[PDB]
Design a binder for this molecule. Structure first.
Ligand SMILES: CCCCCCCCCCCCCC(=O)O
Lengths: 204, 40
């Protein structure tokens, strides 16, 4: 239970491109996947939205154990029949209605927000939530295409310095922050493919 | 004054002579754990 507060645990997170070769054949490439050291949150505030409802506001409001930073090394090594998607799975001891807000940010400014509402399913004494094959927005699809058309890997990492994603999962009724996950990116060079480190965000 | 839009973002890296986006501290130069830049 790495990405887990007192109330919610994200067990799975993956962003992928699925290509339909023929009616019975599908090829799926994972860009990033999840399936703890501390970072001073003040070091990253500039890469995320400010003001009320922004990362600092959310962090100050707490709980402190709900805040995480994920560093992804993304696997971009991949080629009418394309689906770009993201899937994630969560578990809670409580039956809540949750909302998941995903903000794509550039130079700390919100470019798009996706908002998803998820209801609980009973599962072995606890409750499960799944966001299954959420379509990647057009901005993200275009961003990936532009990144891949850059001549050099160092150029891709340069662009990625100022591209972030903020995920805020909230109890809809109470507005309690269940999980807040800040995502930062580099390109993978590894032979194993996509990698990640998960960090706890702390006040200092 | 700088621009913060999608073409400008990639333009700044592809054609640095015409770059007009905000300037920032590189992640490598910030107070971050060593593991941040060394993948497993
Ligand atoms: C370096 C960018 C390629 C890595 C793949 C991006 C990770 C996707 C995170 C989920 C963001 C979903 C936002 C949306 O399109 O609704």
């Amino acid at each position: 239970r790495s990405v887990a507060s007192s109330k919610l645990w994200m067990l799975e997170f993956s962003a992928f491109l699925e290509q339909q070769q023929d009616p019975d054949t599908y090829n799926k490439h994972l860009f990033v996947h999840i399936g703890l050291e501390a970072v001073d949150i003040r070091q990253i505030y500039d890469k995320f939205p400010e003001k009320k409802g922004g990362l600092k506001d959310l962090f100050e409001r707490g709980p402190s154990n709900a805040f995480f930073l994920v560093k992804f090394w993304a696997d971009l090594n991949t080629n009418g029949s394309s689906f770009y998607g993201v899937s994630s799975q969560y578990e809670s001891p409580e039956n809540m209605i949750i909302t998941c807000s995903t903000k794509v940010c550039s130079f700390g400014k919100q470019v798009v927000e996706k908002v998803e509402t998820e209801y609980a399913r009973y599962e072995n004494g606890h409750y499960s939530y799944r966001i299954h094959r959420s379509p990647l927005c057009e901005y993200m699809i275009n961003f990936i295409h532009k990144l891949k058309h850059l001549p050099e890997k160092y150029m891709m990492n340069s662009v990625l310095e100022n591209f972030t994603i903020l995920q805020v999962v909230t109890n809809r009724d109470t507005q309690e922050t269940l999980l807040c996950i800040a995502y930062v990116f580099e390109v993978s060079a590894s032979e194993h493919g996509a990698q990640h480190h998960i960090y706890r965000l702390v006040k200092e | 004054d700088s621009e913060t839009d999608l073409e400008a973002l990639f333009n700044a890296v592809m054609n640095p002579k015409t770059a007009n986006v905000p300037q920032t501290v590189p992640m490598r130069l910030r107070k971050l754990p060593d593991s941040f830049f060394k993948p497993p």
